[PDB]
Design a binder for this molecule. Structure first.
Ligand SMILES: *[C@@H]1O[C@H](CO)[C@@H](O[C@@H]2O[C@H](CO)[C@@H](O)[C@H](O)[C@H]2NC(C)=O)[C@H](O)[C@H]1NC(C)=O
Ligand SMILES: *[C@@H]1O[C@H](CO)[C@@H](O[C@@H]2O[C@H](CO)[C@@H](O)[C@H](O)[C@H]2NC(C)=O)[C@H](O)[C@H]1NC(C)=O
Ligand code: NAG
Ligand code: NAG
Ligand code: NAG
Lengths: 48, 49
């Protein structure tokens, strides 16, 4: 959508492939390897 | 953008019209500015924390 940022991703040389792509929030936001780079932030519900 | 509905494209541009920045003024509450009346209560001739 207009005014939104696309899913953060990086292309890097790995296992002799020039463009092995990796992205944020993998495997999923609940089990993410680093929640810090994931745009989905775990939050407890506030009262009301 | 605010929403995402394309209401119109008539006369839309990217000009930075606010080169002189959004104006600023200092908050001074000494005359009651920024305060509000408390519920259904009246306080007379007194100071309240
Ligand atoms: C936003 O909507 C307007 C129409 O409300 C789109 O403008 C039209 O774009 C097409 C592209 O083929 C032209 O044929 C028309 O002449 C344009 N004007 C009108 C009045 O229809 C516009 O493309 C939309 N998208 C954006 C990003 O502005
Ligand atoms: C509002 O409250 C003030 C402070 O209690 C009152 O001021 C006093 O008034 C008496 C006369 O009635 C004077 O002798 C005192 O010297 C005053 N003190 C001060 C600090 O000014 C005032 O009368 C009250 N006004 C009303 C309408 O209730
Ligand atoms: C805890 O979580 C972090 C972030 O995913 C991870 O680097 C770390 O290895 C995990 N530690 C354990 C004990 O699971
Ligand atoms: C989300 O917005 C906050 C400010 O409210 C900002 O600190 C944070 O970096 C933003 N995160 C992303 C992924 O845009
Ligand atoms: C608009 O111009 C002012 C003055 O140079 C600058 O501070 C501001 O960052 C500019 N805005 C954008 C979105 O470039």
């Amino acid at each position: 959508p207009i005014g939104t940022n696309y899913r953060s991703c990086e292309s890097t040389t790995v296992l002799d492939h020039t463009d092995w792509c990796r992205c944020s929030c993998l495997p999923d936001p609940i089990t993410a390897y680093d929640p810090r780079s994931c745009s989905q932030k775990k939050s407890l519900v506030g009262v009301g | 953008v605010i929403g995402d509905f394309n209401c119109t494209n008539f006369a839309i541009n990217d000009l930075n019209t606010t080169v002189p920045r959004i104006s600023e003024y200092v908050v001074d509450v000494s005359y009651g500015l920024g305060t509000y009346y408390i519920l259904d209560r009246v306080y007379l001739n007194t100071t309240i924390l």
